[PDB]
Amino acid sequence: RKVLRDNIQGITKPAIRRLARRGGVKRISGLIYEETRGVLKVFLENVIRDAVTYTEHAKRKTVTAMDVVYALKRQGRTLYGFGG
Amino acid sequence: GKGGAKRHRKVLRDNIQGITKPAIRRLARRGGVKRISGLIYEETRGVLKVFLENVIRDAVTYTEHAKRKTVTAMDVVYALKRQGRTLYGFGG
Amino acid sequence: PHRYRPGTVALREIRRYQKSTELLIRKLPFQRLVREIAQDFKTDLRFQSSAVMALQEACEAYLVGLFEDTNLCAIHAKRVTIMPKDIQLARRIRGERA
Amino acid sequence: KKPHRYRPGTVALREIRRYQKSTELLIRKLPFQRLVREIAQDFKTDLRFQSSAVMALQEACEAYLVGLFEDTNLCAIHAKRVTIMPKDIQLARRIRGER
Amino acid sequence: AKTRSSRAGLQFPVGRVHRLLRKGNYSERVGAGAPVYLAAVLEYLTAEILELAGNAARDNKKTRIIPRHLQLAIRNDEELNKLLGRVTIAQGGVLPNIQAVLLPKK
Amino acid sequence: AKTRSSRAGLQFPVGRVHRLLRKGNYSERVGAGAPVYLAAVLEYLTAEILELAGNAARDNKKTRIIPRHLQLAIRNDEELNKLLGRVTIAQGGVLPNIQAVLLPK
Amino acid sequence: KPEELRQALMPTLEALYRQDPESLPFRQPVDPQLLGIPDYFDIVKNPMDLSTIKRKLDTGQYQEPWQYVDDVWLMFNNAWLYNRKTSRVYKFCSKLAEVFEQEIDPVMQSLGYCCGRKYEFSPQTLCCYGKQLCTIPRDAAYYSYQHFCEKCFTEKDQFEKKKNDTLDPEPFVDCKECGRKMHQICVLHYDIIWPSGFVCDNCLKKTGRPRKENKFSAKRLQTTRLGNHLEDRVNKFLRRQNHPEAGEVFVRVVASSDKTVEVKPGMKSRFVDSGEMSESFPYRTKALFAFEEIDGVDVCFFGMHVQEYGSDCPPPNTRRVYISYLDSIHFFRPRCLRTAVYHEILIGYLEYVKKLGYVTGHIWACPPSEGDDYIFHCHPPDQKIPKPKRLQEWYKKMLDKAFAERIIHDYKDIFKQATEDRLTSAKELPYFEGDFWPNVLEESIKEKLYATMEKHKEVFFVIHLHLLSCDLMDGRDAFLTLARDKHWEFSSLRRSKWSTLCMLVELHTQGQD
Amino acid sequence: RSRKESYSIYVYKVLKQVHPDTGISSKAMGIMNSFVNDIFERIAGEASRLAHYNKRSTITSREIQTAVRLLLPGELAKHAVSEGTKAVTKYTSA
Amino acid sequence: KDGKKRKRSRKESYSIYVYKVLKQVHPDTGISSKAMGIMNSFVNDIFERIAGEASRLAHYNKRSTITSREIQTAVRLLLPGELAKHAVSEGTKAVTKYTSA
DNA sequence: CCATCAATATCCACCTGCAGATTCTACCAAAAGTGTATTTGGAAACTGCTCCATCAAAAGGCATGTTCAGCTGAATTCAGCTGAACATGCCTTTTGATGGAGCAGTTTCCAAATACACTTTTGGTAGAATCTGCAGGTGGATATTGATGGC
DNA sequence: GCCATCAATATCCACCTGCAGATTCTACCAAAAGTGTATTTGGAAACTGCTCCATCAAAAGGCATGTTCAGCTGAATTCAGCTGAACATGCCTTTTGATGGAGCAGTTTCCAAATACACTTTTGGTAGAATCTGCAGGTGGATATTGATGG
């Protein structure tokens, strides 16, 4: 597979602004976008590490939503609608 | 009886007021607080009060299950565990 | 030329995005980031569409809740504009950092 | 002739160091057994308390308060202040999610 | 020819939930009334949350319950909010809430 | 002849761990190596936690481990810090830590 | 005269006043209205306080100080009774009373009286009559008329219900000349010994002739070869020690008879019906006691009983001795030789029977249960009850010391002895009266024997060595019953002296020879 | 294909009981199934822990009721306890 | 003596094993009773945590037996890189020694 | 500043096309439930042993009032940060189709886990007696910080 | 405004010494713990049916990206009312030790209550086709909302 990279910038400035507006934020500073990108990224490797270890425990090469529910539940961030 | 039945009967202190505000100051010093507002203590009282019904009730709710009315260290430590504040040293 | 005062459109879109519930981050940049960092953890992995949707929804919820925490921490300092130390404090209170 | 007086903060910092280097309990005992007794009989009348259970409750309460107090100090210093304020403790409890 | 679910006057299947309890590896043995109590609790919780979701949908001029209605029901009930404080509802969104300070300061 | 702990070169009792697994209702069947690996993991964690406790004690001019040394050991290692980050320690106190603004001048 | 009584009694009362804050509640009469205790007069019928004592002494209302002592103890008892033990007044009264014992004796000893203590006997336990075998429990509801247990009458309302808590006061004697009240125990006066009445030493000092010699002493008791040997050995050991506090010790056998032990019905059916062993085993029982000269009077400090089966006794009891009961009093002087004296008694017995031809000895080393008196009634409260291991070590030390003198050939436990003898049946076990083993065998027959031997291995000791008619001392039950009825206690030195005097008089005058 | 059980029909019956003319979407059904499964797992695990704590090897009504009291706060807890007592009484009365 | 009054409350504890581990890691260091209780509680709650993770890993994948792979993955979930690798290495060494025993 | 007014986002009623919600026909294997057989968690009664509430004195602290240096917020001013607007265009988002890596159902069967049954060791517990880490207690003494003072 | 330094203080350490607490040694034994044997079984491999996971085409409009102006918001500065910090004063409340019995636990009985399993019946998914239906989405205009226009 192609070794893709540098798509953390894909979380665009208007997207982060919209997420902040949904959270009740009225004014946003410039570096907020990239630093919240970093926080999002950190949450991402944590959650995918848990989900991928779950999947590898099942001898599977495809990550399913059910292991995602497992990871979210075990991180105290239980998600509904995707099984479990 | 007679004599000695009047030993420190100054009960005119509220139950929540027994937290002994200097103890709150000591806890703040342990918490790294340099300056404390004057009316903070009492609300922390209430705050700690809340924590008590957050914790002990759970342990209290354990007590009747074992057909007992004496709260044990195991009930307390498991009440802390179920609330996310597990404690060490009282599991024996 | 008609121009609204600063904050009016921001507050209008605040109600707009607090009224709707659709996914707010567009899909495939998140998909590509997940693929890259998962390959960094383990190569040759595959992902279900429902799995990526679950990741997207969970991350949106986590960031939006961080955003109410952010607004509370910012207004705590008599401010209406958010700066990184706000969410740093919010996470250190949450226990995410220290 | 003007008896010696430390400036505000030096004794505060000394107490900070003293209570951060020590491990003894800071909440007085007898009021704590009282508080737990009345709050327990508020839920079930005529309860009995073990010494170990009371010690565990006291240690847990002191730990919860002290940690909330670093949280409150962080909230206060975030607002360019040094004195803890009720808005600081409310913000800390709101972020923790207990509220 | 009476099912134990109908015998207890409940809608949820007592047999299935008892089988799940046995398969859940909770202990060596499971009592007879435990699945009945469990089914009653589950049906009460779902009835309350569905009633609140239907009320929210009616408030939105909607007759079909959507995840937004479920989120509105769960968040506007402080007890149910305490039940689901650490759980995210898919496609649920957030409650409309703007601080007074965020409002114009004219 | 030889204990399962001795056969695995472990001080912790493998048989006791297996019995606890059986009575813990985690699974109706338990693998042979699961109690051995549990004993090894708990032995490992005990090894570094007691090592850091002894280091704290010798830095504190003390030869007996006390809960204060235990908290000093557990908190000073950030991984070990998060292991007991949501855990309340008895008779340990707090770490010496003062904010920059609190310091004079 | 009031002046002498006042100049005597002010020091102790003032010392009582000195105690603070213990004596503060006793400065004034108890006022129910002021103290808010309207029920004070319902419990305390005759209250008095320190001010009442002062005003009564100042007006000279005492003609002898025992009324002072009785009033002080009565107000002490009132304070203890009305107030709970955990209250202020109870412990205040306890401290004041302790000061009272610490101060009263030197003052009253100079006024011409024996002592200044108010003495109350132990609660006298009663005995049942319907069953003729049970007794009346102490500190419990009891039935009596004109005495029955709680379960006796149950298998009509004229009975009286009460709880056994009453106490018996010490007897008092009045001097025929002075008339001063005296404690009978303290003065050691007894009517049969002195038919002329009680005369204080002060009056006899105005006469010249002292108290006449007491013929009812342990010295004049009938002597026996065994008792003579024991007393000679003890006296020789004491002379070798030459302790200044040690006195002459008299060992006398006061009872000896021939009895038979009957096989119990279970073992009677299992072993006697077949005819392999006889229905009963004859033996000789003897009782001996040790008396020491303390403070010019005899004090009994040792008692022990043996059962002796001679050469004509059928096996397995042939040529054996068994120690049935053993008792002692720790008031021997000096204490450091007390234990060393006891050995010289029992070892002296072990040698003596060895001279007579006996081969085997048996010892049942079982510590007494709390409240159970072996021979002497009312053991002192401060007398240490040895642990079973301590008693076994004491007996082992005795056997080792006797072995060192080449008197004892060997000593083992019953389990090791049975294993070495290759015993295969319970019938080979020695048969003794009231022994634990016959009861164990009866229980086993009613419902592993070697396991029972091993459990009680350290308790029983087996030793390889190679008529006076007295109904009172024919067994430990009669003497204990008489002591309980007559309050013959051994709980203190003076009480032990009085009890020894009484038992010596009983043996001297009520004997059958 | 492997059977995958769900509580869709029971939730539908309950919502007909409480709202005869109200429908639900498939995603709403998934959310509801996830919620009921999660609360089931939570209270069942709490009951199992309570049984383990008192050396009890069976889940009966008393300990599961206690677990529901622990997790459900206030009015919901009282309603659950009352309805459970009623349901177990009805079950044992036939 | 049936119904002995001394004691019949055998309390499960890992005290001697923790003391031994202290001996290997620090032969000349003491230990307090309170610290020993802290150690017992820590090893205990770690035991229930890891056992629960292994149990859920077995249950979710329709696996009725808890084997070595289950605890491998459970340790990988609970522990980040350094502690996880060291614990995995020592556990693998222990199980290999047991197998070859 | 209070009043009208123009530009603009919002609410909302209405109507059309359709993916999705709801209704039957038939199927069908997975449970559910009844009725014996067997086993056992625990209700229930009696009782010895803990330890918990109650109460005492000895003591290490706590509760008020005073003085004031320093904390915090109101008031003020200003650089420039980002919100509002707009132009350009990036890439999106769906609709479509496709090769195949990979998930999972079905069959076989064996090394591994289990249930006893027996023998072995062994950590708990209790009591005796030895060892010691350290909690304070006592003599300096030491930055250290507030204060007096000189530049 | 800086700072070099007499002077009271809590504290680090140099030392110590007695004791509650930790450490060492002997002994008993039920409870595990290890080994043996027949039994059962969960999952390894082997092959394959099959669902969706990954991959390439295309286009055009929804926002993504870049630029500009300034509204006002964040940031810096003064200062004054004042709330708390430090401290001396008085006393009281807390801490530690001793002592009855209310219940925490150990023993025994036995029965209502729990599994094991062989059928039989009901029942919950669910392939498949048909009809019903709530709201996605576009239209149009009356309706608040905002900002600064005449004066």
Residue numbers in the entry:
A (entry chain F): 19 to 102
B (entry chain B): 11 to 102
C (entry chain E): 38 to 135
D (entry chain A): 36 to 134
E (entry chain C): 14 to 119
F (entry chain G): 14 to 118
G (entry chain K): 1086 to 1231, 1235 to 1243, 1264 to 1555, 1620 to 1638, 1655 to 1701
H (entry chain D): 31 to 124
Sentences from the paper on this structure:
Here, we report cryogenic electron microscopy structures in which a p300/CREB-binding protein (CBP) multidomain monomer recognizes histone H4 N-terminal tail (NT) acetylation (ac) in a nucleosome and acetylates non-H4 histone NTs within the same nucleosome. p300/CBP not only recognized H4NTac via the bromodomain pocket responsible for reading, but also interacted with the DNA minor grooves via the outside of that pocket. This directed the catalytic center of p300/CBP to one of the non-H4 histone NTs. Representative writers of lysine acetylation (Kac) are E1A-binding protein p300 (EP300; KAT3B)8 and its homolog, CBP (KAT3A), which can transfer an acetyl group onto the NT lysine residue(s) for all four histones. That is, p300/CBP reads H4NTac at the bromodomain pocket, rotates in multiple directions, and rapidly writes NTac to non-H4 histones within the nucleosome independently of the DNA sequence.
By preparing CBPBRPHZT (residues 1084–1873) protein corresponding to the same construct as p300BRPHZT, we also determined three complex structures in which HAT of CBPBRPH is oriented toward H2BNT (CBPH2B·H4acNuc) or H3NT (CBPH3-I·H4acNuc and CBPH3-II·H4acNuc). The overall conformation of CBPBRPH·H4acNuc complexes was almost identical to that of p300BRPH·H4acNuc, and the H4acNuc-binding modes of bromodomain and HAT were also almost identical to those of the corresponding p300BRPH·H4acNuc structures. In all the structures obtained (five structures of p300BRPH·H4acNuc and three structures of CBPBRPH·H4acNuc), their bromodomain bound to H4K12ac of H4acNuc at the inside of its pocket and to the minor groove of the nucleosomal double-stranded DNA at the outside of the pocket. The position of bromodomain interacting with the minor groove varied from complex to complex, but in all structures, the third basic patch present around the BC loop (BC basic patch) interacted electrostatically with the phosphate groups of the double-stranded DNA backbone. Collectively, these results suggest that not only p300 but also CBP can acetylate multiple non-H4 histone NTs by rotating themselves on the nucleosome with their bromodomain bound to the acetylated H4NT as the axis.
